[PDB]
């Protein structure tokens, strides 16, 4: 072989419980004044009803399962009850020097972001921006664990949230601006001695329930993001011929599965024991907590995250890429 371990960077498509467990730890440290992200009925802090694709990926490749990793957290958390009376916490967590540095909500590029809520009549004033963007994860991994030895496979899957906070936040990025941030991040991996890079584009989320009414904006971003991303990875592969870059075309995989289900009625993988019959509906309703009888019929778990069945589909394709040795 050429790698005995996998390192993962990105968002809730890859995260095995960082966003969840930091909200759990902050909830405990504040006696319940911070809301828990990825609560039940989500599976053990995954934004899905089971393991995510990084977990199936270790399985398919016979490598160690992902272990959560993150950098030191140190924040002054300022909250106000509904009287406007202020309460301050010094929240601290030691670095966790694991292998899966992915975090729900993370955008391509550097810095911290806000994706945690106050609970129980409290409102957050400052200090809740403790979560780390994909480039920041890489920065913190390198600080804690040093340069890559080159016996690693490094997964990179980011950009979904550059879209998310453009649609619903005050981020105001084009797809190709978001791609730029991804390409800077992947270059940092190469510069840090990454010799095997599994780089995924943004899935085809045109039918993501949470993007209802935003289909044109989401289409333009994802296509212009993925166009720029691919162009940039071809250049990086030319610049770095000692680096194996595998382009996981998550968009094309999603598009194929969605197409098979709309035109044939199902997408069946007999080797995975998975049959999808639904590529447009939520298996789980965020607002009610209610969950359909057979979620693993669905592409979508909630209004955006895939089900564990779709994660296994994603991991099979990615694993086949690496095993096939099809690099840029």
UniProtKB/TrEMBL annotation:
Keyword Signal appears in the UniProt entry: yes
Pfam families registered for this protein in UniProt: Lipase_GDSL
Domain of life of the source: Bacteria
Annotated GO MF terms: hydrolase activity, acting on ester bonds
CDD domains, sorted: fatty_acyltransferase_like (cd01846)
UniProt cross-references to InterPro entries, sorted A to Z: GDSL, SGNH_hydro_sf
UniProt keyword annotations, A-Z: Signal
PANTHER family for this protein: GDSL LIPASE_ACYLHYDROLASE, PUTATIVE (AFU_ORTHOLOGUE AFUA_2G00510)-RELATED (PTHR22835:SF659), ZINC FINGER FYVE DOMAIN CONTAINING PROTEIN (PTHR22835)
Entry's family note: Belongs to the 'GDSL' lipolytic enzyme family.
Protein name: GDSL-family esterase
Organism: Photobacterium sp. J15(2011)
């Amino acid at each position: 072989a050429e790698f005995d371990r996998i390192t993962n960077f990105g968002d809730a498509l890859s995260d095995i419980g960082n966003k969840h467990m930091i909200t759990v730890d902050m909830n405990q440290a504040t006696s319940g004044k911070i809301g828990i992200r990825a609560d039940k009925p989500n599976f053990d802090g995954r934004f899905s009803n089971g393991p995510v694709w990084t977990e199936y990926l270790a399985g398919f490749l016979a490598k160690p399962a992902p272990v959560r990793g993150h950098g030191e957290i140190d924040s002054q958390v300022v909250l106000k009850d509904q009287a406007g009376k202020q309460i301050t916490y010094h929240y601290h967590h030691n670095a966790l020097p694991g292998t899966n540095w992915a975090v729900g909500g993370a955008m391509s590029g550097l810095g911290n972001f806000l994706d945690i809520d106050a609970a129980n009549g409290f409102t957050a004033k400052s200090g809740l921006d403790v979560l780390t963007n994909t480039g920041q994860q890489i920065k913190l991994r390198i600080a804690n664990k040093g340069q890559f030895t080159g016996n690693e496979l490094v997964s990179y899957m980011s950009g979904t949230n550059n879209l998310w906070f453009t649609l619903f936040g005050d981020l105001d990025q084009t797809g190709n601006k978001a791609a730029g941030f991804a390409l800077t991040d992947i270059e940092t991996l190469i510069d840090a001695g990454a010799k095997q890079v599994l780089a995924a584009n943004i899935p085809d989320f045109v039918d993501a329930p949470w993007f209802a009414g935003q289909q044109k904006k989401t289409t333009r971003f994802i296509q212009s993001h993925n166009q720029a991303l691919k162009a940039g990875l071809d250049q990086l592969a030319a610049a770095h011929p000692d680096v194996e870059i595998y382009y996981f075309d998550a968009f094309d995989l999603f598009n194929k599965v969605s197409n098979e289900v709309k035109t044939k009625g199902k997408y069946q993988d007999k080797e995975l024991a998975i049959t999808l019959t639904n590529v447009t509906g939520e298996a789980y309703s965020y607002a009610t907590g209610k969950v359909i009888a057979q979620p693993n019929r669905n592409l979508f778990w909630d209004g955006l995250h895939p089900t564990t069945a779709m994660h296994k589909i994603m991991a099979k394709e990615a694993a086949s890429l690496v095993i096939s040795g099809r690099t840029l």
